[PDB]
Amino acid sequence: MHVFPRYAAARPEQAAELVRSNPFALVVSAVDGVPVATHAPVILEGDAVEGGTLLGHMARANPHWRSFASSPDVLVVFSGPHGYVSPTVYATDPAVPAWDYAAVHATGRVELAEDALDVVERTVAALEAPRDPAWTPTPASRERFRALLPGVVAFRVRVRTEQSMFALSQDLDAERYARVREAFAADNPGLADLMDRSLEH
Amino acid sequence: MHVFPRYAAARPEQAAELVRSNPFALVVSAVDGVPVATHAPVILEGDAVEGGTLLGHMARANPHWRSFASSPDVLVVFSGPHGYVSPTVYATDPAVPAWDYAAVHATGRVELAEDALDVVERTVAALEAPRDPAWTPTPASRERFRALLPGVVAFRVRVRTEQSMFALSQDLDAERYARVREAFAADNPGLADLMDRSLEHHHHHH
Ligand code: HEM
Ligand code: HEM
Ligand SMILES: N[C@@H](CCCNO)C(=O)O
Numbered sequence A: 001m002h003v004f005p006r007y008a009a010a011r012p013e014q015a016a017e018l019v020r021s022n023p024f025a026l027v028v029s030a031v032d033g034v035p036v037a038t039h040a041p042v043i044l045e046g047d048a049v050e051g052g053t054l055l056g057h058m059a060r061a062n063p064h065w066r067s068f069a070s071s072p073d074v075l076v077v078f079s080g081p082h083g084y085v086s087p088t089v090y091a092t093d094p095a096v097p098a099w100d101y102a103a104v105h106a107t108g109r110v111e112l113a114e115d116a117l118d119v120v121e122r123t124v125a126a127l128e129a130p131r132d133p134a135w136t137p138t139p140a141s142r143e144r145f146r147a148l149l150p151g152v153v154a155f156r157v158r159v160r161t162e163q164s165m166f167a168l169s170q171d172l173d174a175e176r177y178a179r180v181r182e183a184f185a186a187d188n189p190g191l192a193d194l195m196d197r198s199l200e201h
Numbered sequence B: 001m002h003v004f005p006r007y008a009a010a011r012p013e014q015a016a017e018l019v020r021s022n023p024f025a026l027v028v029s030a031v032d033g034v035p036v037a038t039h040a041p042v043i044l045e046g047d048a049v050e051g052g053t054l055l056g057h058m059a060r061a062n063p064h065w066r067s068f069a070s071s072p073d074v075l076v077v078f079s080g081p082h083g084y085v086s087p088t089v090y091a092t093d094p095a096v097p098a099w100d101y102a103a104v105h106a107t108g109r110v111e112l113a114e115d116a117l118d119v120v121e122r123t124v125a126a127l128e129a130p131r132d133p134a135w136t137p138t139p140a141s142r143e144r145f146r147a148l149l150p151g152v153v154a155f156r157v158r159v160r161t162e163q164s165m166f167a168l169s170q171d172l173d174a175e176r177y178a179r180v181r182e183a184f185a186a187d188n189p190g191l192a193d194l195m196d197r198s199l200e201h202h203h204h205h206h
Helices: A012-021 A063-068 A116-128 A139-151 A174-187 A189-199 B012-021 B063-068 B116-128 B139-151 B174-185 B189-200
Strands: A024-031 A034-045 A053-059 A073-085 A098-113 A152-167 B024-031 B034-045 B053-059 B073-085 B098-112 B152-167
Touching (some): A012 A152, A024 B073, A034 A116, A034 B024, A034 B073, A053 A098, A063 A098, A073 A152, A098 B034, A139 A152, A174 A189, B012 B034, B012 B073, B012 B098, B012 B152, B024 B053, B034 B116, B053 B116, B063 B098, B063 B152, B073 B152, B073 B189, B098 B189, B116 B139, B174 B189
Antiparallel strands (some): A024 A034, A024 A073, A053 A152, A073 A098, B024 B034, B034 B053, B073 B098, B098 B152
16 A cells, blocks of 8 residues: 555554454455455454554455465455545536545464454454444353354464555545535445544544 | 355356446555555456456556566455444344455456556546436546546456355345344445345355
8 A cells, every 4th residue: 555645644543443443354465476365354452553463363164364374474454434536526627536535554474363262252342342232242152152163263463564544535625625525424424424533633 | 265155146247246336446466475455446347357357547656566567466356335243133142243245356467558548537437327417527627637647557457266255144044134134224225235136146055
C-alpha cells in the first residue's frame, strides 16, 4: 500500500480502531512466488497495530497454514467502510470519479499458535462484545469447541510495519464534501459514520 | 483460498457476477516472500473469470507496479457482501459463530497495459453502468483524463485460476437458515439478496 500524504491517519488510535472494528480480515502469504489469501477473523492484542500482535484461526483443511510453519512474513489486510464516488455526486464539470475507503495493512512474522482454543475463545469474546445482548458460550458450546479443535489451526502475527489509508474525501472543499457525505448517508451509513469519526481529529 | 465444497459456486456465472458487481478489488504481489497489496478498481474482460482478463490501474507514484516485471504472479481478490453470524441468531445450544461472505480470488500473470486511457475509460463505463442516471464523461472531463494519464499505470491480468467462496449458510438447516437471512434483511440487504441468488441453483450432493 502506498499511503498518499493527504490520506494518512491523523492519530495512531485511528488505525487500531479500524482493526478492532473490522476483524474479518484477509491473511496473505507467498507460496512459490504466488500470493495466497484466506479470509479469517483476526483480533489485535495491544494498543497499537505496529508492534502489536494479531491472532487468528483458519481451517486445518485449508493448506494455507502450512506456509506459516517456517514463520515467513505475512500481510493482514483490514478493510473498513468504502464506497464509489460518482461525478454525479460532485455535480461539477471537469470531474473524475473516486473510491473512498479506509484500510490498515499489517505485515510481520507469523507463528503457529499452540493455544488454539484460547485464540478462538478470545475471538468469540471480541466479536460478541459490540452486540447487545452478547452471546456467552455455554459449557455445551465449549465442549463443542473442544470437539472441533482438531480441525482448526491458530496463528499469531507480530506486526513489524503498519500502513493505514483513510481516503475519506478530506481533501475536498466544504461544498463537495457535504455532497459526498450526504450521498453516503443514505445506503452507506457506515462510511458516513467513518467520515464523521475521521474529522473528529 | 481453500474452497470448502459446501460453499462452492453452483455455476461459474456466479463468480463473474460477483467480480462485475464488486470492482473495488485488492491487487496483491509477492516480492521476496513479502506480500504487497493495493486497493484499485479492476474490471473483467470476458464471460468467465478463469481464462479471462482483468484490467485495472493504480498510481504511478505507487511503487507496487515496479514489481510487476520481476514478480508477475499476481492475485486479485474481489469481495462481495459479508457479515458476522452470531449464535444469538441461531437461538440454539451447542452453537459456534460464523462469518458469511462471498469472494472471488483470481490468480495469474500481470503485464503493463499500453492503452491506459482505454482502461480508465472502460472502468468509468463499467462503474457507472448500474447507476441511474449514469455519468458519461464530458469533452472537458475527457480532456482532463488525457492530462492526468501520465500519473497512471494501467495493468492487465491473464487469469490462470479462479477460486470462489460462497459461505452463505447453506449448510444450516432450513429453520436456522431462515433466521440468518431474516436477521441480515434489515441492515445488510446486500447479503440477504446474495443468499437468495446463491441458493437458487445451489446443489447439495454434487
Ligand atoms: C468467534 C467467531 C468465529 C468466526 C468469525 C469464525 C470464522 C471462521 C472462518 C471464516 C473459517 C474458514 C477459514 C478458512 O477459510 O480456512 C473458520 C474455520 C473453522 N473454525 Fe472458526 N470462527 C469463529 C469461531 C470458532 C470457534 C469458537 C471454533 C472452535 C473450535 C472454531 C473452529 C473452526 C473450525 C473447526 C474450522 C474449520 C471448518 C471446516 O474445516 O469446515 N471457530 N472459522
Ligand atoms: C472510474 C472510476 C475510478 C476509480 C474508482 C479510480 C480509483 C483510483 C484509485 C483507488 C487510485 C489509487 C491507486 C493506488 O493506490 O495506487 C487511483 C489512481 C489514479 N487514477 Fe483512478 N480511478 C478511476 C478513474 C480514473 C480516470 C478516468 C482517470 C483518468 C486518467 C484516473 C486517473 C488516476 C490517477 C492520475 C491516479 C494517480 C493519482 C495520484 O497520483 O495521486 N482514474 N484511481
Ligand atoms: N463450520 C464448522 C466450524 C465453523 C467454526 N468457525 O466458523 C461447523 O459448523 O462445524
